[PDB]
Structure 1
């Protein structure tokens, strides 16, 4: 059935930066989470909502982005939606896409908007019915924001997601919004909303997944107010301040299921622990949506088939191991995910780390809280402390220690990285 197909656009490249040392080799929307590219986590979310027509904005690596999509599963006839890709200027800012949208006049009716890549399992099919109803009597209903009930200090609620909402407890209408900044000591709103609202609720327990349900007018509106760049600090603020004239937005606070956005370094770690922990069922390794061979084991251990688990190697809890990957003797792994085809030396110690496709670690290596990108090699007797981040190709010489947060690279920017061994105090490329 038509239903105006229910469109949905995905704003990649929006948060391309903060994952800086790696996003220059491959874009954020394609790096692996639990040995799986992000956008897949977002796509199956979209399909869960009944989307039938997807448009993806691209700026960085628009080729290998589309090339994946073309050879993806979503380019098949079994796919529930027809994904098209779109290229625009690099470092694309929100709204500037929306303005470029209606300039193509390709928005048919209500649609959903996602700035980045999302892991979630909430059925929006109820949110639209919430949205599309109260709209059919008030065509000034413009955006429905979906958010997750949580704790103020929840591990999955960081600064960008840390906001304060004020909602009409009866009709759920956000009448005031402001972000949490160190220094913004107070919450101030013109009281004339009280003369228009009987029962309000101030909440700091939300998340702001930024998965807004946008109406039909929104793109054209973003062309009417060309100043609007950020959907949260320019759009809504204009609506609440009556800059945009006589229009309303609404909030839908989910209380079950899961929803979050991969955006920051301090979230990739959190969400990985949140999908390893079965918080995003069915979107778990044990489902193997891409024909993987994963299987749940107790204490949240996930392995693929055909994996060399050496005897006397000890696998602790909350970790994940891809296929075709070897592990040496007397080695210890704990709370780390591991890409496919890796090779771990003997008598090593891993903890809280993140390993990607085919990575080689020598004997007697100690790792912790480190991201190790695709196809990287580490010599023996090495050691990597927390916060470290290395890109692809990088290789570390034997008997070496990379200090905390010392990001590296195999490219020619300002970052300290260079490939060949040794690569810390001993330097290549400088």
Structure 2
């Protein structure tokens, strides 16, 4: 009832994005002209978190830094933020064991892997969690989930799971993640006897936003074989690998909640944010003192945006400040960062533009991410799935095929720089 704290496992999904994030961490990527971590913080602030620990590995320098000069390190901040640098591929549990070894956990804490976007107030979810625990100390964790439809566009594969819940006590008695190849749902009978009402739900979105008790970091040192909070911990609790413990669900029927854990979720959530689903967390709220203004058909423009006449920008389009768009250019369903330049006769549809991206005349761009200071030459075609990492310069009359990942760095992703750009890569 006092002093809650939250554990943010940043760096969880880095390398899922990687072409991007060979430059800046995943938690600092802009979703809709705003850093991905800011959403998580605004969520924890909404929850009333007093203390945050951000487990981070790659680019922890930048992360450490953003957090210092951010408003969350100011004295008026709702919670104190502390970073914990770990080694590569940090697991949930490895961090929990590290939390136990360092003895950092007081009370109940909110455990989150990656970055969340949510306007769901956890305050009442906490009260139910505390009241449940005040007579039963074996009630270990409350799983926050979102009511949805089976084929909901926000309900991806990780979120696609079957829950079997006691309709009154809201106790999860069964969990199995959906994976095609497995065509059955089966659980031992004896549950039936013990409960007397039971709801099997394939309509739930597993947000993996979890309220945990004091026991968890200690329980993860006791069970050192546990690495995933779902198929190791939850499975173990339900199969009694971890003795005599109770797991619980909270079904949110309102609001919004989701995690940016992949490219396709980053895309779908970006849509869900431009639609007012995560209100008040929308561009025109300007939490970082922007100048975003809402307009009809979900068009978000900052001040000092230069729109030439005969330029037409269609629905669900966001444009950062100091951005120029050329004559006869059509921008539809795309997000554009600060200080960009788009030439004449361009057609940009469902794409993503971060800061300082320059695009020359006569270009067709669609369903692609163009990181900071990416330059696109005249008469270029960028197709679906394309990921153009920061700094990359595409030469004139060049076509990037679907899904090609381009970078400016030392590794796996195809194609450095200099035009005309790959093929003909002037790539080191």
Q: How high is the TM-score relative to the length of structure 2?
A: 0.99
Q: Distance in 1 between matches of 2:183 and 2:357?
A: 47
- How many residue pairs get matched? 428
CA distance in 2, matches of 1:418, 1:111: 44
Q: Does the aligned pair in 2 maintain the 1:340–1:358 contact within 8 Å?
A: yes
- Deviation per residue, 1:305-328 (Å, 9 max, x gap): 011011110010111000011111
Tell me what 2:37 maps to.
39
Deviations 1:60-109 (A, max 9, x none): 10000010000001000111101011101111111000000111111111
1:357-377: CA deviations, max 9, x gaps? 110000001100000001100
Q: SS of the residue aligned with 1:44? A: helix
Helix, strand or coil for the counterpart of 1:416? coil
Q: In the alignment, is the contact (CA less than 8 A) between 1:395 and 1:423 conserved in 2? A: yes
State the Cα distance separating 1:425 from its structure 2 match: 2.4
Give the Å deviation of 1:21.
1.1
Deviation at 1:17, TM superposition (A): 2.1
1-side partners of 2:99 and 2:199: how far apart?
35
Aligned equivalents of 2:57, 2:190: Cα separation in 1:
43
1:100-130 per-residue CA deviation (whole Å, 9 max, x = no partner) reads 0111111111111101100000111100111
Aligned to 1:306: 304
Partners of 1:295 and 1:75 in 2: how far apart?
Answer: 28
Q: Which contiguous aligned blocks of 4+ residues in structure 1 show a shift greater than 3 angstroms?
A: none
For residue 429 of structure 1, report the CA deviation from its aligned partner: 1.6
Output one character per residue of 1:372-408: Cα deviation in whole Å (capped at 9) or x when no partner. 0011000001111111111001000100100000011
Unpaired stretches in structure 1, ≥5 consecutive residues:
none
RMSD between aligned alpha carbons?
0.8
CA contact (8 A) 2:143 2:210 kept: yes
Residue by residue, what CA displacement relative to the aligned partner does 1:166-201 show, whole Å, maximum 9, x if unpaired? 000010010010011110111111111111010000
Relative to the length of structure 1, the TM-score reads: 0.99
In the aligned structure 1, how far is the partner of 2:2 from the partner of 2:279?
A: 29
* 1:178-257 mapped onto 2 (5 Å cutoff): 178-257=176-255
Is there any run of 5+ residues in structure 2 with no aligned partner, and where? none
Q: SS of the residue aligned with 1:187?
A: strand
TM-superposed deviation, 1:5: 1.4
CA–CA separation in structure 2 for the residues paired with 1:417 and 1:101: 41
**2:319 matched residue in structure 1:** 321
CA distance in 2, matches of 1:278, 1:113: 26
C-alpha separation in 1, matches of 2:147 and 2:3: 30
1:193-223 Cα distance to aligned partner (Å, 9 max, x none): 1110100000000111000000011001000
Contact persistence 1:4–1:108 (CA under 8 A): no
Cα offset for 1:4? 4.3
Is the Cα–Cα contact under 8 Å of residues 415 and 425 in structure 2 kept in the other structure?
no
Q: Do 2:52 and 2:81's aligned partners in 1 also have CA atoms closer than 8 Å?
A: yes
The question of whether the paired residues in 1 share the 8 Å contact of 2:417 and 2:425 is answered with no
Deviation, 1:426, is 2.1
Q: Is the 8 A contact 2:416 2:426 kept in 1?
A: yes
1:95 aligns with 2:98: no
Name the CA distance, whole Å, in 1 between partners of 2:373 and 2:71: 25
In 1: Cα distance, 2:82 partner to 2:7 partner: 10
